[PDB]
Every structure is written in structure tokens, then in C-alpha cells.
mmCIF file of N, CA, C and O in Angstrom:
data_model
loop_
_atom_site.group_PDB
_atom_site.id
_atom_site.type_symbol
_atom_site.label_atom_id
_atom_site.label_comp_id
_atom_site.label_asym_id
_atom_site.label_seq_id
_atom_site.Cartn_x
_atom_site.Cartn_y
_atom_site.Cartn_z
ATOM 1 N N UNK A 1 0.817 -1.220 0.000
ATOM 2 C CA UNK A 1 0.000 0.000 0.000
ATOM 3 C C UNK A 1 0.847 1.266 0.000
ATOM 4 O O UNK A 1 0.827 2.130 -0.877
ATOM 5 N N UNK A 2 1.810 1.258 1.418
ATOM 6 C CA UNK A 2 2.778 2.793 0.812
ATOM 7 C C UNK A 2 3.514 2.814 0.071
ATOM 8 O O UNK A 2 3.788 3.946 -0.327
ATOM 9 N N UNK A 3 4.171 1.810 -0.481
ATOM 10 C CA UNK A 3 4.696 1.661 -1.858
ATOM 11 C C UNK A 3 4.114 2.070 -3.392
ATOM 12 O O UNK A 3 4.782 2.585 -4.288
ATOM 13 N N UNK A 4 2.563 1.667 -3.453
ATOM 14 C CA UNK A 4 1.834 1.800 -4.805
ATOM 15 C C UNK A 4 1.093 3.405 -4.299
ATOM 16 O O UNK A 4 0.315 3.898 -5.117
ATOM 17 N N UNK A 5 1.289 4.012 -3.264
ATOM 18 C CA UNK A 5 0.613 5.149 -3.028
ATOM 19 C C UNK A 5 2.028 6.118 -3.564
ATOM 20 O O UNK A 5 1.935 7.054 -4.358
ATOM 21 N N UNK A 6 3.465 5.588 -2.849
ATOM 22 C CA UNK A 6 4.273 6.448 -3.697
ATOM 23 C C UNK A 6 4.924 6.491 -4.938
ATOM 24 O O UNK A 6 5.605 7.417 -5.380
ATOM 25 N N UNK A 7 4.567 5.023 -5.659
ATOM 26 C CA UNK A 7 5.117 5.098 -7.225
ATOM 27 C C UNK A 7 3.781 5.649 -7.666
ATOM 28 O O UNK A 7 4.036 6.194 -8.739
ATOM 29 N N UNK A 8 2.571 5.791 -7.429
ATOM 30 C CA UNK A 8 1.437 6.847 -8.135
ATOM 31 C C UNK A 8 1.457 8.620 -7.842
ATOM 32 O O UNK A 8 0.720 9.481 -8.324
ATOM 33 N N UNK A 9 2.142 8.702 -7.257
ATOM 34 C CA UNK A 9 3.186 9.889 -6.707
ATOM 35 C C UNK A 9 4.089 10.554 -7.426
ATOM 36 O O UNK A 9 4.164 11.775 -7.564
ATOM 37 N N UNK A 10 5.027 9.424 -8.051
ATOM 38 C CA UNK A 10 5.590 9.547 -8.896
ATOM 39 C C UNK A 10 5.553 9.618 -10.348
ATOM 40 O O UNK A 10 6.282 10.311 -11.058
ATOM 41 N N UNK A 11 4.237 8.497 -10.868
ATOM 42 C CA UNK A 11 3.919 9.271 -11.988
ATOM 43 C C UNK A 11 2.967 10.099 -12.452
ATOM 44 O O UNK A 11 2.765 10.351 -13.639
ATOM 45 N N UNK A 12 2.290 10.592 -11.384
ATOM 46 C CA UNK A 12 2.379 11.799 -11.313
ATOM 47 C C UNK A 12 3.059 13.097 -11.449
ATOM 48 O O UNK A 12 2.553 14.149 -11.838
ATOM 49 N N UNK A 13 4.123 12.911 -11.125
ATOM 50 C CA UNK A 13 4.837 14.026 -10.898
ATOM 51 C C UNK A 13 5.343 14.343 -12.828
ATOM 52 O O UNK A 13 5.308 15.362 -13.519
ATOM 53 N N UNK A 14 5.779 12.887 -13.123
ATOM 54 C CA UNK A 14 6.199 12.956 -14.401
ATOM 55 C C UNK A 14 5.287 13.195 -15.017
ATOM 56 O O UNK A 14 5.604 14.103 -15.785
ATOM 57 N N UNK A 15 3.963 12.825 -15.204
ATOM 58 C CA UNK A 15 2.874 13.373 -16.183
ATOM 59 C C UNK A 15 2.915 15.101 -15.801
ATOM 60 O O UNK A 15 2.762 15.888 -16.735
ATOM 61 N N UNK A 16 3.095 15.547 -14.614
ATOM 62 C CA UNK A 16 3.053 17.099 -14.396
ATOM 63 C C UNK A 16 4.279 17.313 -15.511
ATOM 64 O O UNK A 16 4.147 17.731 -16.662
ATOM 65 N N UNK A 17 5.379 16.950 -14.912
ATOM 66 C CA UNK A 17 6.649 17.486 -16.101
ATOM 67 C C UNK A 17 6.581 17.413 -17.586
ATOM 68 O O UNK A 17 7.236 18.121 -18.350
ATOM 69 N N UNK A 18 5.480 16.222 -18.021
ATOM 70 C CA UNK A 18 5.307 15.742 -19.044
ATOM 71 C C UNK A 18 4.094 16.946 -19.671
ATOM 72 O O UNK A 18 3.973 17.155 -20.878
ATOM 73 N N UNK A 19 3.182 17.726 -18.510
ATOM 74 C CA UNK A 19 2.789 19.052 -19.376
ATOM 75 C C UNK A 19 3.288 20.578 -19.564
ATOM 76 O O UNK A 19 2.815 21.538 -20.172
ATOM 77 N N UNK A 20 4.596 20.362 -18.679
ATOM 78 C CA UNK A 20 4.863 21.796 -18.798
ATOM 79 C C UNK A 20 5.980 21.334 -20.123
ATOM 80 O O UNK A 20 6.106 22.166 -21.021
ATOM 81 N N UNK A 21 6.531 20.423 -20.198
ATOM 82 C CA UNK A 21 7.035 20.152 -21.361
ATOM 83 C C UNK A 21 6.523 20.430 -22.968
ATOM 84 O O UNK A 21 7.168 20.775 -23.958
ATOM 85 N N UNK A 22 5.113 20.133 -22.787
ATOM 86 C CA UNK A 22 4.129 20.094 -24.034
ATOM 87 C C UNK A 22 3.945 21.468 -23.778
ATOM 88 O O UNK A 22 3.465 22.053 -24.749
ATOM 89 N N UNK A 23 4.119 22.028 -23.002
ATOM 90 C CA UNK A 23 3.655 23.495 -23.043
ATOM 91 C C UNK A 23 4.897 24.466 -23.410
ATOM 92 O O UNK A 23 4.806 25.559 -23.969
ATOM 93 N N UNK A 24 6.262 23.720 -22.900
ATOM 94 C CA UNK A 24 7.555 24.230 -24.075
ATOM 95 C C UNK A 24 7.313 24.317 -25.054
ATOM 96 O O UNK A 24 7.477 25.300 -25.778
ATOM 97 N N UNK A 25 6.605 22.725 -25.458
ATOM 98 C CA UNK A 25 6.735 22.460 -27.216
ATOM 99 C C UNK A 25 5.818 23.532 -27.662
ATOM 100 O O UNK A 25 6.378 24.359 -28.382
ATOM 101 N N UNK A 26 4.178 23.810 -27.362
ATOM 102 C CA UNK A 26 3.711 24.916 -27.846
ATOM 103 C C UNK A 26 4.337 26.137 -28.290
ATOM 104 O O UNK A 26 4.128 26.652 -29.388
ATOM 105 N N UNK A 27 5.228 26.652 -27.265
ATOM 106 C CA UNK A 27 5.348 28.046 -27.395
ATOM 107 C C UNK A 27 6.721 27.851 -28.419
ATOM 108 O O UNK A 27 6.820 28.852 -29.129
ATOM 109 N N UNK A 28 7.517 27.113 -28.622
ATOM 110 C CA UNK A 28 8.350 27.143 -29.287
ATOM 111 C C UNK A 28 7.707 26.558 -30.871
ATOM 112 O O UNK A 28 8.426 26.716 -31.857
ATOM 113 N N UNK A 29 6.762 26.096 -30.982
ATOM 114 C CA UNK A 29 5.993 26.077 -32.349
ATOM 115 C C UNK A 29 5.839 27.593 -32.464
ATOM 116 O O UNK A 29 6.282 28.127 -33.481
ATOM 117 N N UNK A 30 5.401 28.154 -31.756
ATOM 118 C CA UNK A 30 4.051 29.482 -32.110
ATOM 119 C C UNK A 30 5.564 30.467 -32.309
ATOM 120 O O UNK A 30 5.406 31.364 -33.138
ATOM 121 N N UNK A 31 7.088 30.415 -31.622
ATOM 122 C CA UNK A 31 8.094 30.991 -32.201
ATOM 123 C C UNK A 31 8.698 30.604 -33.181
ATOM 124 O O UNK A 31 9.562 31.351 -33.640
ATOM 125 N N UNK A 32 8.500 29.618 -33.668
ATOM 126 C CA UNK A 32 8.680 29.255 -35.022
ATOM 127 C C UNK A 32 7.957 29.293 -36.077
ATOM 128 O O UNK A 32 8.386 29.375 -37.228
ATOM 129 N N UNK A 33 6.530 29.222 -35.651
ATOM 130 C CA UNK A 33 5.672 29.857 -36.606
ATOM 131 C C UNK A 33 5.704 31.657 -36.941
ATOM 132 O O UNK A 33 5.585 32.147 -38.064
ATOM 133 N N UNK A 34 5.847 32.237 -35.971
ATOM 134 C CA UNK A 34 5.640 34.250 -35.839
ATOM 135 C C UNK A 34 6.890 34.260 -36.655
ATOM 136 O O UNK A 34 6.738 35.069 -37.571
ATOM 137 N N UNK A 35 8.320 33.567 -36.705
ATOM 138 C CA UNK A 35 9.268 33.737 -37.043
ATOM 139 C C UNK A 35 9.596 33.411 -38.616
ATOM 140 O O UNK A 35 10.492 33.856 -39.333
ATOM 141 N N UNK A 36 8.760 32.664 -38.836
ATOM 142 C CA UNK A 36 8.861 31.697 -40.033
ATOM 143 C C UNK A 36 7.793 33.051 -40.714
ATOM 144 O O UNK A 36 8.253 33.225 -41.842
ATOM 145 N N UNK A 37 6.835 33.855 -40.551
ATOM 146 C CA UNK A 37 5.746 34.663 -40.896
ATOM 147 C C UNK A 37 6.762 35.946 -41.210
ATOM 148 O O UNK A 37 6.540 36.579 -42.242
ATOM 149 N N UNK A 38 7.571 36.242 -40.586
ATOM 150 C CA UNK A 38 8.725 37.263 -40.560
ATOM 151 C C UNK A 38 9.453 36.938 -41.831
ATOM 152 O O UNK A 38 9.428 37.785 -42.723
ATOM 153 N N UNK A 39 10.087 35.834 -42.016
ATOM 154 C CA UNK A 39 10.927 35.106 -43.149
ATOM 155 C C UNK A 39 10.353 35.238 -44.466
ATOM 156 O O UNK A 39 10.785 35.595 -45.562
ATOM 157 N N UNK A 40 8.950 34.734 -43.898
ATOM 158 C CA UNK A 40 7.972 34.641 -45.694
ATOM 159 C C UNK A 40 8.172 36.625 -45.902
ATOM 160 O O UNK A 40 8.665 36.974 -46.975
ATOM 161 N N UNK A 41 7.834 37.616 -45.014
ATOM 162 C CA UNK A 41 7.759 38.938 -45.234
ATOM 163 C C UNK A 41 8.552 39.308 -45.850
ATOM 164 O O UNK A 41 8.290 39.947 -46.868
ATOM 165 N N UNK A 42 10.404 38.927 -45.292
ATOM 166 C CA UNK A 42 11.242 38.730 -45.909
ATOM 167 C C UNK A 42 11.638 38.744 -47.083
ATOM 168 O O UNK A 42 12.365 39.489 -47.739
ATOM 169 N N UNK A 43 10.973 37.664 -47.310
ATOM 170 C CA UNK A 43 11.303 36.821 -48.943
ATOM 171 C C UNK A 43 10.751 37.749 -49.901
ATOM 172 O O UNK A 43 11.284 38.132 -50.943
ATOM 173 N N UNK A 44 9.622 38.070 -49.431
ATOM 174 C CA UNK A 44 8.625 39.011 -50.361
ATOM 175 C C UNK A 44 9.445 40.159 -50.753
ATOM 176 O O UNK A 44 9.588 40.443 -51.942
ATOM 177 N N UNK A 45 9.971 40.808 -49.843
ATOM 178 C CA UNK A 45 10.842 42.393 -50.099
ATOM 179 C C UNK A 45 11.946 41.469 -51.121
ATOM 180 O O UNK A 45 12.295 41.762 -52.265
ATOM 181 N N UNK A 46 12.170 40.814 -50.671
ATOM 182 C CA UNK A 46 13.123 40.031 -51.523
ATOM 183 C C UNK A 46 12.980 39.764 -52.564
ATOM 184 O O UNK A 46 13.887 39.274 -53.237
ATOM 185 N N UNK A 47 11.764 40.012 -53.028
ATOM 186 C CA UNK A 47 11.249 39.778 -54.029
ATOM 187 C C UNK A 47 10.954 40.923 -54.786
ATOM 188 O O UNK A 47 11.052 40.911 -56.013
ATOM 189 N N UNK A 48 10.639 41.808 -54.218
ATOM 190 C CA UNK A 48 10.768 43.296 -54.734
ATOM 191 C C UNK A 48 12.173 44.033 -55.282
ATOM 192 O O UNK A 48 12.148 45.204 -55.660
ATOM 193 N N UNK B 1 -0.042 -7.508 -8.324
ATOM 194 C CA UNK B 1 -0.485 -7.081 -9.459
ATOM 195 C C UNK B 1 -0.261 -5.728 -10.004
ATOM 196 O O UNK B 1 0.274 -5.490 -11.086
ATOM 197 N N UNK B 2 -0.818 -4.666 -8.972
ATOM 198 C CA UNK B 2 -0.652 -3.018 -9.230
ATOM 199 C C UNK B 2 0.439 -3.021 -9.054
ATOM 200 O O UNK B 2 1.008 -2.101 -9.642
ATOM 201 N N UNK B 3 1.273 -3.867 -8.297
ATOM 202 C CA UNK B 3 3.314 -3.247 -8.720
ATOM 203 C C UNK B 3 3.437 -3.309 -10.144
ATOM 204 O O UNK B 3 3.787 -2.473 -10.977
ATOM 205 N N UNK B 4 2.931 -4.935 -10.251
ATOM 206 C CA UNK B 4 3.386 -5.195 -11.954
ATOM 207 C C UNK B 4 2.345 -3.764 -13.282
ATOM 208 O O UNK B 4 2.666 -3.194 -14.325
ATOM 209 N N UNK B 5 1.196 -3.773 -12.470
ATOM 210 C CA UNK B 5 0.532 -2.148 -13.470
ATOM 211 C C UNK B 5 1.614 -0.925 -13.608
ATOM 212 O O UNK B 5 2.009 -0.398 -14.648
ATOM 213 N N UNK B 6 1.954 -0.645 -12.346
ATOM 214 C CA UNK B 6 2.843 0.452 -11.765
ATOM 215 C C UNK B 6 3.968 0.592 -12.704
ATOM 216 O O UNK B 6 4.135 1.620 -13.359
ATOM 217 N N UNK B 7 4.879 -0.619 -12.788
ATOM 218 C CA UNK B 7 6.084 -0.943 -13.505
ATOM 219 C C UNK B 7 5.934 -0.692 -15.155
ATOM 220 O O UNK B 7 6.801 -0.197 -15.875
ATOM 221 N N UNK B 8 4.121 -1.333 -15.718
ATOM 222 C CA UNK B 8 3.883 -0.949 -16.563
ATOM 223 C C UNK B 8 3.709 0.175 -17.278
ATOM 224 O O UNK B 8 3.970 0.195 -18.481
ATOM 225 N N UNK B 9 3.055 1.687 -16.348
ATOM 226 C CA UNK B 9 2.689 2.661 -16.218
ATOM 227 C C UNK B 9 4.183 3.715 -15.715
ATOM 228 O O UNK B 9 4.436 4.918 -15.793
ATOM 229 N N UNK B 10 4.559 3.094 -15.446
ATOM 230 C CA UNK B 10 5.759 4.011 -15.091
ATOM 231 C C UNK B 10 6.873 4.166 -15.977
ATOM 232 O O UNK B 10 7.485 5.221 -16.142
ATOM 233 N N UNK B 11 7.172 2.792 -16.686
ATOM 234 C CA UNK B 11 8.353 3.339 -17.669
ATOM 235 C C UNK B 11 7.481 4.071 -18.935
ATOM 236 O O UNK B 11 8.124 4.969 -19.477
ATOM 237 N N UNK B 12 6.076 3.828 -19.513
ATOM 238 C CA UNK B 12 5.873 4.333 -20.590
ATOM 239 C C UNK B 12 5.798 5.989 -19.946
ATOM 240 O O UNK B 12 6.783 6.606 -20.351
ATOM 241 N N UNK B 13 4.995 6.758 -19.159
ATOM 242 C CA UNK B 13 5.042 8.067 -19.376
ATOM 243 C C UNK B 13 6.807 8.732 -18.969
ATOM 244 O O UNK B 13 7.167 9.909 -18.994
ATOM 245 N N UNK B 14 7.503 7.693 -18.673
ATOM 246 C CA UNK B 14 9.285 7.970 -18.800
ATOM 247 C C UNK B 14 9.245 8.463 -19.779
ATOM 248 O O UNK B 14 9.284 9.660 -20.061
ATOM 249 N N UNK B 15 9.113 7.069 -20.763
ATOM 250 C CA UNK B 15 9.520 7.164 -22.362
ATOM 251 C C UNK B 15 9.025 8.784 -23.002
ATOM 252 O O UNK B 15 9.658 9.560 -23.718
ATOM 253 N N UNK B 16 7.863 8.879 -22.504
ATOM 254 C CA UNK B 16 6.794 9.699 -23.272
ATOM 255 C C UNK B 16 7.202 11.189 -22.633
ATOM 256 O O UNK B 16 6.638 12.053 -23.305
ATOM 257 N N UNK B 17 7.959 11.745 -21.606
ATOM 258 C CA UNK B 17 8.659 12.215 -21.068
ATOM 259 C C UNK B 17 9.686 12.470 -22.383
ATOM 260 O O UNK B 17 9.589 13.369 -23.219
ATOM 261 N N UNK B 18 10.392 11.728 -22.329
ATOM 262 C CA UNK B 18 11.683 11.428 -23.050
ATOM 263 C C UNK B 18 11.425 11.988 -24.668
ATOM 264 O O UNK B 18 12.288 12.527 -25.361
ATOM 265 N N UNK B 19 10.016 11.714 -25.070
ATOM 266 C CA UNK B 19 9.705 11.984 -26.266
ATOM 267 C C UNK B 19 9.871 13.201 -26.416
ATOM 268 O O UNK B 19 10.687 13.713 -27.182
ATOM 269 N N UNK B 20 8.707 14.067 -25.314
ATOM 270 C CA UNK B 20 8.547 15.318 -25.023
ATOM 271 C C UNK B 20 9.930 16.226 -25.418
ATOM 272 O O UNK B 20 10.042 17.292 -26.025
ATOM 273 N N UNK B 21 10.950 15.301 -24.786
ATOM 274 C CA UNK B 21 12.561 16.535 -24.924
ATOM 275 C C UNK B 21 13.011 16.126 -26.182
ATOM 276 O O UNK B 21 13.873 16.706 -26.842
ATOM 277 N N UNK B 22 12.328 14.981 -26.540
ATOM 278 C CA UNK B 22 13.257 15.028 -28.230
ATOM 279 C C UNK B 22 12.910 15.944 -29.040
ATOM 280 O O UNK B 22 13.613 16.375 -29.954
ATOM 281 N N UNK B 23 11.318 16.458 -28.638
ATOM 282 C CA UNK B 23 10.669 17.731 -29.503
ATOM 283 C C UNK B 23 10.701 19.126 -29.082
ATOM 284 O O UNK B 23 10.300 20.059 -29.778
ATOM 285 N N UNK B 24 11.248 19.238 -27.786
ATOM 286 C CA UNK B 24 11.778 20.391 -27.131
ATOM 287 C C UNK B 24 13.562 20.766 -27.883
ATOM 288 O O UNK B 24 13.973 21.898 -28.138
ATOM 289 N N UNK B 25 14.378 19.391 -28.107
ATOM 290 C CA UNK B 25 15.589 19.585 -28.411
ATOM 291 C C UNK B 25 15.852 19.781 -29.945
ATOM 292 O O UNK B 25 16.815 20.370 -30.436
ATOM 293 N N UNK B 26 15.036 19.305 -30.470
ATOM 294 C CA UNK B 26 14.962 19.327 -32.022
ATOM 295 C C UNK B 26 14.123 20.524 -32.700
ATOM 296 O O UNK B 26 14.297 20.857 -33.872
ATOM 297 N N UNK B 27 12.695 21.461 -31.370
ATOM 298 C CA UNK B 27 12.774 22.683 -32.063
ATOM 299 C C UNK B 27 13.162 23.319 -31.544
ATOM 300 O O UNK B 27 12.792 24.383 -32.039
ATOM 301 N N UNK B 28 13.922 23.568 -30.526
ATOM 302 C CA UNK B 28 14.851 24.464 -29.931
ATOM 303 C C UNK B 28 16.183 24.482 -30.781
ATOM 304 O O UNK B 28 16.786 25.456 -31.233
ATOM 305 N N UNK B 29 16.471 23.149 -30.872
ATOM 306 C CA UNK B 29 17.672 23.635 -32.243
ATOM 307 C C UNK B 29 17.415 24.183 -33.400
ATOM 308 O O UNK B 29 18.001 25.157 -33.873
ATOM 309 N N UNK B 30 16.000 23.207 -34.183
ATOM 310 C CA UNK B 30 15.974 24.515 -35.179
ATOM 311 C C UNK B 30 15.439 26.068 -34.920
ATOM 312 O O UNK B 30 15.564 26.955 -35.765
ATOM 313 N N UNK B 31 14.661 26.306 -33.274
ATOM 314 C CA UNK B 31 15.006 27.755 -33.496
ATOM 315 C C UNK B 31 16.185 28.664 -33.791
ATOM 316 O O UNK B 31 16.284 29.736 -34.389
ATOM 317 N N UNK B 32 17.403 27.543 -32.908
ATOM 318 C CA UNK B 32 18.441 28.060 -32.713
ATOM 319 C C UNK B 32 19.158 28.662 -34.152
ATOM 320 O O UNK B 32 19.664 29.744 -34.451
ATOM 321 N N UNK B 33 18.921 27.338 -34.897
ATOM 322 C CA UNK B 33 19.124 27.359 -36.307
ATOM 323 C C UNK B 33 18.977 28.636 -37.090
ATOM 324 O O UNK B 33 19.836 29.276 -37.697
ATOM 325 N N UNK B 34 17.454 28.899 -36.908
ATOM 326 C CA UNK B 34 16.738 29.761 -37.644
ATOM 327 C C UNK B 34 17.100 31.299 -37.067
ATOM 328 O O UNK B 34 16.695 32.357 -37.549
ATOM 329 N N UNK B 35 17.895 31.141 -36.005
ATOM 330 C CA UNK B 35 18.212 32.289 -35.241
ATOM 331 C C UNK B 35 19.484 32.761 -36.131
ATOM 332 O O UNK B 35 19.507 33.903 -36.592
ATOM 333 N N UNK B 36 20.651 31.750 -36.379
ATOM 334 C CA UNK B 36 21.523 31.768 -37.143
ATOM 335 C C UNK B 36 21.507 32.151 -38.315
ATOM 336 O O UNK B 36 22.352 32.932 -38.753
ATOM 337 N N UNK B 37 19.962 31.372 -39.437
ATOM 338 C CA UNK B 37 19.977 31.884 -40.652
ATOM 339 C C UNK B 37 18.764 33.532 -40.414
ATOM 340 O O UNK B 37 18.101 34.098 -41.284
ATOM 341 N N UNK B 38 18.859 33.794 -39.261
ATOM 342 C CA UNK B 38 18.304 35.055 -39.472
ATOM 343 C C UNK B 38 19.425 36.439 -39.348
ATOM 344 O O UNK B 38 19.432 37.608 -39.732
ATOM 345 N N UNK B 39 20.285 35.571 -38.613
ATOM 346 C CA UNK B 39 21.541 36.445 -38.875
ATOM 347 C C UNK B 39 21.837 36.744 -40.493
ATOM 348 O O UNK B 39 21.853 37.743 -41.212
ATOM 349 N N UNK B 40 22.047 35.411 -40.645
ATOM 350 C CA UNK B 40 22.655 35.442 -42.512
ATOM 351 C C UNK B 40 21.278 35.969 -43.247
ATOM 352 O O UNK B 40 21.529 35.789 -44.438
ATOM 353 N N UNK B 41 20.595 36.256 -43.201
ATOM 354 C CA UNK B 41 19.246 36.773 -43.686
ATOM 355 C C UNK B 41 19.013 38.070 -43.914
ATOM 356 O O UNK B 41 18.700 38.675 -44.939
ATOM 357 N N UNK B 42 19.368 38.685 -41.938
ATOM 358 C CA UNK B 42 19.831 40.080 -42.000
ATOM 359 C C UNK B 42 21.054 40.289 -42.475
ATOM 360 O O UNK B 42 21.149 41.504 -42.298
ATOM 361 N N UNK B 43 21.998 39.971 -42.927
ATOM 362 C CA UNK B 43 23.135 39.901 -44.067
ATOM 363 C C UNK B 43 23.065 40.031 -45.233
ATOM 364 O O UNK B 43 23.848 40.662 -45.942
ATOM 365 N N UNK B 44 21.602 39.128 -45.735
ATOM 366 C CA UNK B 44 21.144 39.642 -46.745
ATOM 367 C C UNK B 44 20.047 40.720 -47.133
ATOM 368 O O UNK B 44 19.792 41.225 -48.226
ATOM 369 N N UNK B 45 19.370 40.944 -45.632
ATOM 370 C CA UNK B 45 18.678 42.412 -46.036
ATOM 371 C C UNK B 45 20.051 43.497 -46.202
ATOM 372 O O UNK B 45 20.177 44.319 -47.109
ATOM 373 N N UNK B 46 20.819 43.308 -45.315
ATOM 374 C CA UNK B 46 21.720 44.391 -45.762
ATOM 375 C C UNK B 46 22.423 44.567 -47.028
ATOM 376 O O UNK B 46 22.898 45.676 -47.272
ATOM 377 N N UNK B 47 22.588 43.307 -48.132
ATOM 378 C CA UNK B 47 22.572 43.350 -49.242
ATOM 379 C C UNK B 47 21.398 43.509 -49.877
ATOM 380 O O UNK B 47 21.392 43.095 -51.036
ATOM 381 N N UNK B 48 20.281 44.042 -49.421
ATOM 382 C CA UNK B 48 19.509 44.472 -50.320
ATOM 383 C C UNK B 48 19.077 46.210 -50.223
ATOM 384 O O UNK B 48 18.604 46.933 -51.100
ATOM 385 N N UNK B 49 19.475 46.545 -48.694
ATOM 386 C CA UNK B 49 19.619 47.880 -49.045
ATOM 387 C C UNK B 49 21.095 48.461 -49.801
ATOM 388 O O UNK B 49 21.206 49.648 -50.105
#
């Protein structure tokens, strides 16, 4: 019993790490997307 | 039984963990990347003024 109460403890903890992680991955999409939107702007003058 | 669930349940959200930083490390490098070719980029806006 205190054994399976603290390995559910534990993955827990990793599913927590496991969303602030996914929540890295978001924001580093959405800077690669704003950035990549900058590039295409870029290209365009570049094109001019 | 729930040890043997536990054991089950515990290495996959590891793994899945583990996944998580392969996609943290791979777009963090290519931001890094893209940070680089924005240097060479602004190199080339400056060859275009």
C-alpha cells in the first residue's frame, strides 16, 4: 500500500513534467511559426 | 499485481517524457538554427539595401 501510493506519486509528478514540457513544445511552435511569418515577409521584399 | 501495473505505467510516461525533450531539443535547435539563418538573412537584407 505505501509503496503503490508512492510510485502513483511519482507518476504523477512525471505526467506534471510531461505538461509543462508540451507546453515548451507549444510556445516554441508558435516561435517558429511568428518567425517563419517574418521570413515569408522577408522573402517578399526580396522579391521586390 | 498493481506493482506489476505500476512498472507498466511508469516506464511508458518515462519514455513519453523522453519523447517530449526530443521535440523540445529538435525545435529548440531549429530555433536556434533559424536564429543563425536570421543572422545570414539580416546579411542579406543588408545586401539588399
Amino acid at each position: 500500500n505505501q509503496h503503490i501510493i508512492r510510485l502513483e506519486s511519482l507518476q504523477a509528478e512525471i505526467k506534471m513534467l510531461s505538461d509543462r514540457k508540451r507546453e515548451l513544445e507549444h510556445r516554441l511552435s508558435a516561435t517558429l511559426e511568428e518567425n517563419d511569418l517574418l521570413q515569408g515577409t522577408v522573402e517578399e521584399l526580396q522579391d521586390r | 499485481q498493481h506493482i506489476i501495473r505500476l512498472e507498466s505505467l511508469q516506464a511508458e510516461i518515462k519514455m513519453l517524457s523522453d519523447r517530449k525533450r526530443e521535440l523540445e531539443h529538435r525545435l529548440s535547435a531549429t530555433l536556434e538554427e533559424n536564429d543563425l539563418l536570421q543572422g545570414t538573412v539580416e546579411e542579406l537584407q543588408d545586401r539588399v539595401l
